[PDB]
């Protein structure tokens, strides 16, 4: 908790990254927020970052699949939120949960181009989305596809037309 | 955090998916104090004595 | 009889409309859910409230429990108008893909899904309406060696339709949506040019 | 945006307060999410034109047209065309307002975009369905100018003029986007619009709307608890209307976007993978091709059109 000479908030301190002006002693974000102090005693400058918060969300596979899980704790530290499968990402905390270098199409998110999936012991592990196959399909200026065999198939949509006429 | 799930969804089935359940918050666990210096003399120190 | 195995086994098929119907009914779930809030109020039954607090102070409260249900509703009625100029939009849509995919044949570009449309067709639901989309689409093709013409007496032959394709022995016309080759004639081309002008000229007696 | 954290600042005695109002802020801390995922929905629709990411050939074949401007640079820290560039670097807390990560970056958009451009730049309409094609490019231009009823004669009498005519344009096209700031104005106001919006949210906070203090906490330290819950209800309409007042707009704006965004939709299905004959629809001439590329918060396009440029008139029959 803070209390700089009537300024109070909460946060964490650190160095400053930024120097100050003569003129001031607190520094200020878009819409005048304080973004840093400058010491009522010492003549050095911290910076205040926010106390970490963020949403908690469960990864989960269908309970008809089975009952392992991992808990995503949004924009924090793992030593801040814990199980033996702890994985820290820039995202969030997952616990119940690893972490593989390779990408893959994903069902859930955890964002920023970070995956999350139930797999092979199935943790939840985080991935990179990968945007399907890469079809590096080859092309020449010499050469012409002409579609021989053809299929019709049929596909669906279903289109809102109307709501409940409530009173 | 499956219980969390299947509280959330007032549901004891959880079909595969990504779910919200909880909050989490860093709390303070201290404090700091700071003022400026108590080197510039207050007149009350002229008034008495 | 995929259409109906996968709609009849995977709920989450029926998940285009699920959605509309169950946001709709929440809505007015939720209306009647948030009755029981006081809004800050002494109480949340206003006759309560009566009962409760002679009229001079009831007043107070009454009005409070009003503007909170009141409020209530503007968010309700607000989202509805919202959502009814996005449900107009899909029901214009609908009538579109009956002109464009039902009674005609659009070539728009996926429109009703991928390929060229051929035909759809409308079913009825609870608010909204359903369709089959039929299109015609490319499984199988051989890429063959290509030119924009084709090199006769030292004339430039354009198809007059189709594209020039050759199997590696034979030069021929196909369509882009279709392999039937041609043979290549006077009656099947247009000149224009010479064999030094297009890049690429095969040659294929016309 | 957590209304609890923007309403009491980590306060115990607030959040018991908070609860008196039951959910007026809680159903926007749902309308918020329901924006962002259609937000999400939307820039799926835009951009996922394709089926799964395609690859440019190795060889850049491409009749002499320079794609490469329009392409992503792989070389670099940052994976963009020189246009998306020009439009992205000029295109612009505790308070408990956060921003939510999109599942797929810039970045990875720029990848679903080459992608596309890869498509109708090697494959030509026929990319929409079935399995990608092949077709020379120099084919696909005979075939986007008869498919605009215009004779593919003038690509064989005017093939230089064509890829020239071509890269001169999207050369002016960098040099407007790059010296003229009001060029980039269909997103930069886009973005300020939201910004500003967000700005004004956490402005206000600081008003305290005829109360007592513009700090809860001040209101609760310095009032006896139940006079303290009078002007903490009253701070806390006023919060409660900003957030329920933005919400609104953003409902309002988030359809007006997805039009927008299912109008880029239609004008790539119809001119980037398309020859669309609809007079002025993708600006004036016949649409032989179009070609996207990302941005921040939106959707970039290059059309490209058969425009008349001199003519005679003679006597008809
Ligand atoms: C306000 O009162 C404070 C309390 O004395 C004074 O701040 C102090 O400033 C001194 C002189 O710079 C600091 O001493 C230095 O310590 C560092 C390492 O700690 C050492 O390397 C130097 O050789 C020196 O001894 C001291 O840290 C600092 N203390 C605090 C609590 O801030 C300050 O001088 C006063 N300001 C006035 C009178 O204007
Ligand atoms: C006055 O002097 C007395 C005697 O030392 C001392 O106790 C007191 O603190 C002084 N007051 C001030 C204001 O200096």
């Not at chain 3, 390929?115 to 063959?144: C, R, W």
């Not at chain 3, 949506?177 to 004639?185: D, M, V």
């Not at chain 4, 080459?114 to 020379?136: E, N």
């Not at chain 4, 906070?205 to 009078?230: C, K, M, Y």
Request: proline share 5%; with cysteine; charged share 15%.
């Amino acid at each position: 908790n803070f209390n700089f000479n009537g300024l109070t908030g909460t946060g964490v301190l650190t160095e400053s990254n930024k120097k100050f002006l003569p003129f001031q002693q607190f520094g200020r974000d878009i819409a005048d927020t304080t973004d840093a102090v400058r010491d009522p005693q010492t003549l050095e400058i911290l910076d205040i970052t926010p106390c970490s918060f963020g949403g908690v969300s469960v990864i989960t596979p269908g309970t008809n699949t089975s009952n392992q899980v991992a808990v995503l704790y949004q924009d924090v530290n793992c030593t801040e939120v814990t199980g033996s499968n702890v994985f820290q990402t820039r995202a969030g905390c997952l616990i119940g949960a690893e972490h593989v270098n390779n990408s893959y199409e994903c069902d859930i998110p955890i964002g920023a181009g970070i995956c999350a999936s139930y797999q092979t012991s199935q943790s939840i592990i985080a991935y990179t989305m990968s945007l399907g196959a890469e079809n590096s399909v080859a092309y020449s200026n010499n050469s012409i596809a002409i579609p021989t065999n053809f299929t019709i198939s049929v596909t669906t949509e279903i289109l809102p037309v109307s709501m409940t006429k409530t009173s | 955090p499956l219980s969390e799930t299947k509280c959330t969804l007032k549901s004891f089935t959880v079909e595969k998916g990504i779910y919200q359940t909880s909050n989490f918050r860093v709390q303070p666990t201290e404090s700091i104090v700071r003022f400026p210096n108590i080197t510039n003399l207050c007149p009350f120190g002229e008034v008495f004595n | 009889g995929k259409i109906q195995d996968s709609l009849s086994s995977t709920p989450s098929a029926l998940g285009k409309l699920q959605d509309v119907v169950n946001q709709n009914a929440q809505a007015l779930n939720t209306l009647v859910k948030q009755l029981s809030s006081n809004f800050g109020a002494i109480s949340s039954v206003l006759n309560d409230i009566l009962s409760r607090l002679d009229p001079p102070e009831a007043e107070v409260q009454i009005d409070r429990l009003i503007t909170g249900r009141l409020q209530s509703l503007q968010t309700y009625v607000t989202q509805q108008l919202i959502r009814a100029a996005e449900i107009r939009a899909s029901a214009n849509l609908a009538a579109t893909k009956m002109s464009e995919c039902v009674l005609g044949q659009s070539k728009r570009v996926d429109f009703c899904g991928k390929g060229y449309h051929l035909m759809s067709f409308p079913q009825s639901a609870p608010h909204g309406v359903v369709f089959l989309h039929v299109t015609y689409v490319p499984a199988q093709e051989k890429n063959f060696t290509t030119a924009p013409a084709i090199c006769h007496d030292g004339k430039a032959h354009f198809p007059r339709e189709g594209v020039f394709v050759s199997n590696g022995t034979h030069w021929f016309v196909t369509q882009r949506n279709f392999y039937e080759p041609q043979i290549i004639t006077t009656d099947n081309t247009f000149v224009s040019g010479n064999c030094d002008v297009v890049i690429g000229i095969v040659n294929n007696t016309v | 945006v957590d209304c609890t954290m923007y309403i009491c600042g980590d306060s115990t005695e607030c959040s018991n307060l908070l609860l008196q109002y039951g959910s007026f802020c809680t159903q926007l801390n749902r309308a918020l999410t329901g924006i962002a995922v259609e937000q999400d929905k939307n820039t799926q629709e835009v951009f996922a034109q394709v089926k799964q990411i395609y690859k440019t050939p190795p060889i850049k074949d491409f009749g002499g047209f320079n794609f490469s401007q329009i392409l992503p640079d792989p070389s670099k820290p940052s994976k963009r065309s020189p246009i998306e560039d020009l439009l992205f670097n000029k295109v612009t807390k505790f308070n408990g307002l956060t921003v939510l990560p999109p599942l797929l970056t810039d970045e990875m958009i720029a990848q679903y975009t080459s992608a596309l451009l890869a498509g109708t730049i090697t494959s030509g309409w026929t990319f929409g369905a079935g399995p990608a094609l092949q077709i020379p490019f120099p084919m696909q231009m005979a075939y986007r100018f008869n498919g605009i009823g215009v004779t593919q004669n003038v690509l064989y009498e005017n093939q230089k003029l064509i890829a020239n005519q071509f890269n001169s344009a999207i050369g002016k096209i960098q040099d407007s986007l790059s010296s003229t700031p009001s060029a980039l104005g269909k997103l930069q106001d886009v973005v300020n619009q939201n910004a500003q919006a967000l700005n004004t949210l956490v402005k206000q906070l600081s008003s305290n709307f005829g109360a007592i203090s513009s700090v809860l906490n001040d209101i609760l330290s310095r009032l006896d608890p139940p006079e303290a819950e009078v002007q903490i209800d009253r701070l806390i309409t006023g919060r409660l209307q900003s957030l329920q007042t933005y919400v609104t707009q953003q409902l309002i704006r988030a359809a007006e976007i997805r039009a927008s965004a299912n109008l880029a939709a239609t004008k790539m299905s119809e001119c980037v993978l398309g020859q669309s004959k609809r007079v002025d629809f993708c600006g004036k001439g016949y649409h032989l091709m179009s070609f996207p590329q990302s941005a921040p918060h939106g959707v970039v396009f290059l059309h490209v059109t058969y425009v008349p440029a001199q003519e005679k008139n003679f006597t008809t029959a």
